[PDB]
Amino acid sequence: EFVPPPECPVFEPSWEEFTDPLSFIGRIRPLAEKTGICKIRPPKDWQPPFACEVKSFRFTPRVQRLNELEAMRPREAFGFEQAVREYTLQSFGEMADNFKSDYFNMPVHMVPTELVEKEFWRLVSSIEEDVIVEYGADISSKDFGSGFPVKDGRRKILPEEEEYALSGWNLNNMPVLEQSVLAHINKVPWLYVGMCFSSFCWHIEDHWSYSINYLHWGEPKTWYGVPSHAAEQLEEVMRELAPELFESQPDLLHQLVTIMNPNVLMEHGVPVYRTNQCAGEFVVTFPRAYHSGFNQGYNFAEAVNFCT
Ligand SMILES: Cn1cnc(-c2nccc3c(O)nc(OCCCC(F)(F)F)nc23)c1
Numbered sequence: 001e002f003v004p005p006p007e008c009p010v011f012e013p014s015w016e017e018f019t020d021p022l023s024f025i026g027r028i029r030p031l032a033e034k035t036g037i038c039k040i041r042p043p044k045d046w047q048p049p050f051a052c053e054v055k056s057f058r059f060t061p062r063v064q065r066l067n068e069l070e071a072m073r074p075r076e077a078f079g080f081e082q083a084v085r086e087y088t089l090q091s092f093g094e095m096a097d098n099f100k101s102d103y104f105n106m107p108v109h110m111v112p113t114e115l116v117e118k119e120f121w122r123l124v125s126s127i128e129e130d131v132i133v134e135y136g137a138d139i140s141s142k143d144f145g146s147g148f149p150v151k152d153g154r155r156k157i158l159p160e161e162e163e164y165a166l167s168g169w170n171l172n173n174m175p176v177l178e179q180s181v182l183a184h185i186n187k188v189p190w191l192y193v194g195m196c197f198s199s200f201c202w203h204i205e206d207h208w209s210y211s212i213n214y215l216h217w218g219e220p221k222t223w224y225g226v227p228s229h230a231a232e233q234l235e236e237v238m239r240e241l242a243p244e245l246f247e248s249q250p251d252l253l254h255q256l257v258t259i260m261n262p263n264v265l266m267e268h269g270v271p272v273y274r275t276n277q278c279a280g281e282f283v284v285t286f287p288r289a290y291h292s293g294f295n296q297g298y299n300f301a302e303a304v305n306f307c308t
């Protein structure tokens, strides 16, 4: 059965260290760049309100077949495996909790994170059991607003929430403009509504950017990270073991299907670290740090690429 990778670093900044995100990330860099990902727990009294327009939040999540890659005599009428469904935040959550409690035969919060992790990787490699989930992924914060309060006049901000609209840890206030000569000659956060087993495969960011992720609420998001010094090692293991039909694809396309059990990387000498990102916690990914993960249950995350 699956062997959990070692835990990535977790930082608990004091109020003083919490003042400036770029300064803090710069200070922790000597350790965190050696693990690829790290977790940051804000001070206990730092609790931004959830600011999305919830009544109008409607979306059609994408369908994910956990074993699609291992499952490569074509099946009868392939391409029509699942019906299309639109949800609200509420109806997706009801669907998500029902799925998970039915799958594990227990209340959703009683399922151990280690068990969901073990079962996720078993299902990904299983050809006898076909599990299909849904992921509200890559929803633009322009659509229904950010999960953070924003002083753009589209939604009311209470006085005690203004500090969150102005916080440097509000993902809308991260620097996103890369320096270039072209910038003189001449992005917003994305939202992720997860359910149990919904997942993202191994990838790095465009321009090898940093990224930061905040889990607004819900069950944890489980991460795996590889430090940038092992990027070529991971890419070589992928080339050796990925399906030949996809081996020659450019990286931007190959990264759509680069699912790989962390133990396979670890067996080939790739350092891998893990974490469970819980509600109210940040995950930072460092430049060219490969990362992948899956959701433990119904949750809501916001992410953006930033530059230093
Ligand atoms: C484009 N992109 C760049 N980085 C990511 C990413 N970075 C950190 C965390 C992520 C998380 O939690 N979820 C997803 O969901 C993406 C959907 C994937 C599917 F459905 F196609 F398989 N992406 C995350 C996405």
Ligand SMILES: [Mn+2]
Pocket (backbone or CB within 6 Å): 203, 204, 205, 211, 291
């Ligand atoms: Mn990413």
